[PDB]
């Protein structure tokens, strides 16, 4: 059954609630972003209104074949009315098209549901600065102090230099990058840009990326593997067996693979700096695990909540265990006591 943290009090609304059949009482389904845990359930046969960003709209139309009449795309940073309720979509600094939703309830309450997000200080100067927020439905994926990780800028620096170095030393070397959902495009796009190649991918993934309103994207991507020396693969195929295999498919055009796995957090972050990361190497194949996150670090999250000063916090990730729930309320109370709200 639809859980309580996917319903919006005093509205006919749910968020990211497509895997529970018809929800008793819902007049509008919101979808924060196109990642399968959140869209799970949607298909061409869905006949209720869905609300979302223009980019999430393009993917529902083209990848899930949802009928155009049930897709209601909204512009960001703009006050719109949905079944008599003022709402605003804001950028979530997660994957392309990913949004936060502000709900202005008829009774005077104000609610912010973050979807998935990576908190930034730039958010402190959106339409969020203009008014109080009473409830915050918060992406809590990394709500624990051991969760540190570097900036996206630092990580893209690392990958660029690494890639450019290896290829200038050995021009017959192939760069491979893993993927399974949208998001983190900057990794492979930045490597291809410094190398002067487009990014070879499967047709299904070229179709995915074509839906994203990226600037000049035609110039950056291709389905022609042979012309390209930066290749996308499934994240499943990024291991020694899968790379030796793919290497053979290229027909003696390359002798060395340098591959990147963008992970979220990994326990080498508690000890190691980004500058000191090393690969796993078996012969002519090396694999880099890089901590590119599109989710708030503990500090980034902490900062955002203490600036927002909400009256109630309702977690949306790591809610399935009592130890987790308990631990998260402990940090919330600390943040509150430390900041005085
Ligand atoms: Ni997500």
Swiss-Prot record:
Triggers of expression: During mitosis. The mRNA encoding this protein contains an internal ribosome entry site (IRES) in its 5'-UTR. This 5'-UTR generally suppresses translation while specifically promoting expression during mitosis, when cap-dependent translation may be impaired.
Tissue: Expressed in brain, heart, kidney, liver, pancreas, placenta and skeletal muscle.
Subcellular location: Nucleus
Domain of life of the source: Eukaryota
Effect of residue 295 to A: Impaired nuclear focus formation, reduced interaction with PIAS and increased sensitivity to cisplatin
Subunit structure: Binds constitutively to TP53BP1. Binds CDC27, which is itself a component of the anaphase promoting complex (APC). Binds PIAS1.
Free-text function comment from the UniProt entry: May be required for DNA interstrand cross-link repair. Also required for checkpoint mediated cell cycle arrest in early prophase in response to mitotic spindle poisons. Possesses beta-lactamase activity, catalyzing the hydrolysis of penicillin G and nitrocefin. Exhibits no activity towards other beta-lactam antibiotic classes including cephalosporins (cefotaxime) and carbapenems (imipenem).
Family as reported in the entry's similarity comment: Belongs to the DNA repair metallo-beta-lactamase (DRMBL) family.
Protein name (Swiss-Prot/TrEMBL): DNA cross-link repair 1A protein
The organism of origin for this protein: Homo sapiens
Gene this chain is encoded by: DCLRE1A
Span covered, complete protein: 700 to 1040 of 1040
